[PDB]
């Protein structure tokens, strides 16, 4: 009879626990082992992985292929806004379906480095430059080239570089952000702007359209496990 | 940098999930409860395994048993403790037809003795599976032929579970509910696909109502 | 490049890359992994070969192309004959996906290869028939508008989830490329044998599904060629076939 | 410091170290 | 003569009730929830005010204790009851009744505790994600200098929701959730001026102006 | 004499007196391993790192105290506000120099104090005070000789015996401070490292400090003496810090 | 006495030493 | 192995 | 193994052995 | 005799 003096939290079932637990089926020769392609061992490694982005988040378009379609064209004008997305990479729409959105909203905090990858899908003869921003919060959104340009921006050209990767940085005054809106975790915005214009020659047609990518960098991590409310259940389904 | 820990594929699948619960009574023979062990009645564990397309790990099983007094017309009712069984009837082995049949001795068939207020009952097992790893989707039929039975419900084949009230309650009628939780322990995982974007319909197959691809803003410039 | 695998040669010649999988190069099962005690049969040069299914045309209204690969090669000559005589079967696939246009068109398609790719029906209390999931070498199509429930036993085969219930836009998980029209005019995907058991029956269970999605659609000006065909080439790669019996059918 | 009771694997802890 | 028992830890490492709440049997499908600050409970949150910023873990022990209301049924015999605490983090899903899927906890972590045990614990870490918890916050939570004034802007910790696991039984039973914190492993800096007018407010320093000291006669009274 | 030389500027003062330097930490610049944003820091150095001198403000017999909300009094000041403005994060310490003079014949004391994360609680207990009321750059918000009543909704609680933040003002001693005692002082010098639980903050939305200027012995003189006896407040940024280059705005 | 139980340092006994 | 009870009986099965 | 934790020789288990 | 506890309040009797 060993002296033993119970303390709190005794017959307690915590849903994250990791006690050992008697097994049910002693000595069962489990089927050995296989080689099977495409181990995964961290969730990362899924939200580093580029997924189309839905940048068209059109009422019209999110139920049809149209919602990855950028549209560019030839516009006698310059400096016009192609489009601008919140960086809220698990709560706005743009982003929190994306592969990086689906895993970021089973966490509660994220931190880290987004890759934005812009493909031009347009005519092999067409030219031009865009320039892709990411401004800061503390202003409002860019609402002109002039203001989006005073921050970390890129200008690319669709001539060589049929796809480019805008490297968004983690700058924020915490070490995290929370996954759900908080104007304290604020992030900034992401914009594009017509550098030159679509210069198309004869014979093919002068409105394209642009397909963007998401993942994660390397200095990317989540954190507090949690449940994501995409998924809803009313009675147990058969 | 930060460290990725809580982002591994062992913190995101090893937590408790109730997989399913049933309840069943005192009175009547037909007063046990059965399911069919499927990990596709619920939907939370269900998209998180089906983030992968194979799975290999054992379980941690758990049972949240709570019972309540149902309506009574005797003057005085003190029923004493409860105390519950819970089979498992693998595939082919005999099964329980009524609340007092032969197969509840568990000469073979593992089974848990459980008396209420105490701490839920807990088992491990391992990997019980017939391949080398966990399948999450089958992309084929059960017969042949290309015929018969389309999806996952020609591999689940897992075995029955079946819950009793192992007291002989008379004066006042007592009714249980069984809650099944499942934890996955050293998990392996391969073939990540994408995460459901509809909403789960059928236990038993992929069918699917067509839903938006994400939510809606006005225009590419909203913010 | 030229990767003739048999009595086969494609002209890729790009000098650009080649998706390999899960970086898995396909080969033959090791006596470490092996179930089947019979000795197998490697036909080799008279299996591992490229053969073209039929071509289909790329148009404007386009919503996408499917292939379930063993049932894809499995009226294609000696492939398919060891895959009737044989009760298990397993194989890679050096999958090419061939579209050629002019510098004056524009489009851009998504090739994926979805492992265990099981298909949603658009009655939700039946599953899709046979011949509805399968076509052989009639590439079945994904379709514009959702598929009616009324239809019993049907593919629901609205691009956008990519009949699994999942968003579209997020099948690059899967092995995959891009066909931009603009700098590309094939797709090399060469993938291992990825299933959960050594080997498994080749009528049975699709391990693999190929699908051609236009996520950008093809456009042209008036006088550009109109008519531009997409032509897949898929060759078995490693192939072993274990239980010799009667043929199937 | 953690040792394992069960003679059988699955009953051990998570592998979270 | 040590000074041991005036250290941080010593000081801070006892537990205090922070909130407690009632949630009853399937009389109203009523579940509870809570919104998990610091500030509700006057005795910790001016010890814990005696810092600006700090840092540690938490011990959670409940306190659940259960009482049979009044009914009009004959003979009732209520089983022993058992109890579901979820811990819903920011942005997860919320149950809406007593029998929601979100109380599966796949994810969210929840303890199943039955009544007449010894009271559930868990420890928590350091969740903030600062590198120290905020006792104050001189600040806004817009950039435009408006929105929200003070601590408010900085504590999103989620919400805590509570059930009876079990069955209406014939008779009503009314619960009671204590929850207690003790800071574990506790590192505080910058020390401030203790709370000297009452409490007024959760989410806010507002205060009613008091004296600074208790009252005598003259400066000779002794 | 003691000379404290900051870029452009240089203040006199001291007599072998003392600087009180802030928590023992002498401000320095953030280093690589507590740093969070990705994009090199800008240092602009002398043209920041400078002495700033506030409005003068007239100590009389009465004076309740005064009080500056810190990142929103040099907010308006050169080249440090214009890196504030331009910038998403920054992250400074500084240099407080408040200045009084009387002669002899003149009397009085005032605490020179800085707090940290000033919160400050409002007279309607159901609101909190408005961004015009808590802050006043190059203009000294004030506290009152008297409890502030209810209805004004949105004011600070500005009773002195309280120093707005509902403790006992007597107690301020533990923030960083010293005493200008008229008797035996003519100014106090504190110097204030980077006080906050994150790397970097932003500079409007979060003022990390709050200087304040308290009489506990009024100001007092014989008939003669020069009744005007003003203070001015002349803070220093030091090693500051700007992340996050964008549109400017306020 | 020298232990440890659990797998996070969270778990720990206070720093009274 | 470490068996608590000073008979044999009282030991575990013999499954290794 | 046999360890006897009380501080009284009454206290321990029988001499069966 | 090994004690568990770090107050010598906490020890058995000196037996």
């Given at each position: 009879g060993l002296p033993v003096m119970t303390t709190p939290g005794s017959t307690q079932f915590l849903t994250s626990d990791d006690f050992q637990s008697p097994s049910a089926m002693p000595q069962f020769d489990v089927t050995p082992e296989m080689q099977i392609p495409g181990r995964v061992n961290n969730l990362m490694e899924i939200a580093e992985v580029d997924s189309v982005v839905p940048v068209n988040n059109t009422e019209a378009n999110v139920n049809s292929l149209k919602a990855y379609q950028i549209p560019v064209q030839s516009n006698s004008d310059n400096g016009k806004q192609v489009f601008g997305f919140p960086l809220q990479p698990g709560a706005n729409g743009v982003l929190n379906r994306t592969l990086l959105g689906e895993i970021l909203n089973y966490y509660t905090h994220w931190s880290g480095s987004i890759k934005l990858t812009f493909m031009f899908c347009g005519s092999a003869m067409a030219t031009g430059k865009f320039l892709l921003a990411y401004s800061p919060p503390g202003a409002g959104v860019p609402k002109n080239r002039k203001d989006a340009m005073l921050g970390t921006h890129v200008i690319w050209d669709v001539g060589l570089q049929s796809s480019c990767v805008l490297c968004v940085p983690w700058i924020s005054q915490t070490h995290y952000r929370y996954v759900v809106e908080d104007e304290y975790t604020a992030a900034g915005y992401i914009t594009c702007w017509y550098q030159t214009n679509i210069v198309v020659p004869a014979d093919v047609q002068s409105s394209c359209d642009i397909l963007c990518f998401v993942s994660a960098c390397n200095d990317f991590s989540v954190r507090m496990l949690k449940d994501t409310p995409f998924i809803r259940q009313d009675t147990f389904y058969q | 940098y930060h460290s990725r820990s809580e982002s591994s594929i062992e913190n995101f699948l090893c937590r408790a999930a109730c997989v399913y619960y049933a309840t069943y009574t005192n009175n009547s023979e037909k007063g046990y409860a059965e399911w069919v062990i499927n990990?596709?009645?619920?939907a939370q564990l269900r998209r998180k395994l089906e983030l992968f397309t194979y799975l290999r790990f054992d379980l941690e099983l758990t049972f949240v048993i709570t019972s309540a007094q149902q309506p009574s017309t005797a003057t005085s009712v003190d029923a004493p403790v409860q105390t519950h069984q819970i089979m498992y009837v693998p595939p082919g082995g005999p099964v329980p037809t009524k609340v007092t049949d032969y197969a509840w001795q568990t000469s073979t068939n593992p089974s848990v003795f459980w008396t209420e207020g105490n701490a839920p009952p807990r088992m491990s097992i391992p990997f019980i599976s017939i391949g080398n790893a966990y399948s999450c989707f089958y992309d084929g039929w059960t017969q042949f032929s290309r015929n018969g039975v389309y999806g996952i419900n020609t591999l689940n084949n897992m075995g029955t579970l079946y819950m009793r009230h192992v007291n002989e309650a008379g004066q006042g009628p007592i009714k249980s509910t069984v809650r099944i939780y499942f934890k996955p322990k050293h998990v392996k995982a391969w073939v990540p696909r994408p995460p459901r974007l509809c909403q789960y319909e059928k236990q038993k197959n992929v069918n699917f109502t067509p839903t938006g691809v994400t939510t809606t803003r006005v225009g590419i410039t909203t913010t | 490049r030229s990767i003739t695998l048999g009595n086969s040669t494609i002209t890729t010649q790009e000098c650009a890359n080649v998706v390999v999988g899960y970086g898995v190069w396909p080969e033959y099962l090791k006596d470490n992994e092996a179930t089947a005690e019979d000795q197998p049969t490697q036909p080799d040069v008279a299996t591992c070969r490229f053969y073209t299914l039929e071509s289909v045309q790329w148009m404007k209204n386009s919503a996408g192309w499917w292939w379930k690969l063993p049932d894809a090669l499995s009226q294609m000559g000696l492939f398919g004959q060891n895959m009737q005589y044989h009760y298990l079967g397993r194989t890679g696939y050096t999958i090419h996906v061939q579209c050629n246009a002019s510098k004056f068109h524009q489009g851009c398609l998504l090739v994926v290869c979805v492992p265990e790719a099981e298909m949603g029906c658009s009655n939700l209390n039946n599953t899709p028939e046979f011949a509805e999931l399968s076509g052989g070498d009639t590439a079945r199509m994904f379709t514009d508008t959702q598929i009616g429930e009324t239809n019993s036993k049907k593919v629901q085969t609205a691009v956008w989830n990519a009949g699994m219930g999942v968003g579209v836009g997020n099948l690059t998980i899967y092995p995959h490329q891009w066909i931009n029209l603009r700098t590309n005019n094939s797709a090399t995907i060469v993938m291992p044998y990825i299933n959960s058991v050594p080997m498994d029956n080749m009528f049975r269970h699709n391990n693999l599904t190929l699908m051609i999605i236009p996520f950008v659609p093809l456009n042209y000006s008036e006088g550009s060629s109109p008519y531009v065909p997409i032509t897949v080439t898929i060759a078995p790669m490693c192939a072993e076939y274990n239980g010799l019996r009667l043929a199937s059918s | 410091t953690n040792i394992n009771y069960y003679k059988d694997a699955a009953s051990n802890s998570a592998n979270r170290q």
């Open positions: - | 990990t596709r009645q619920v | - | -």
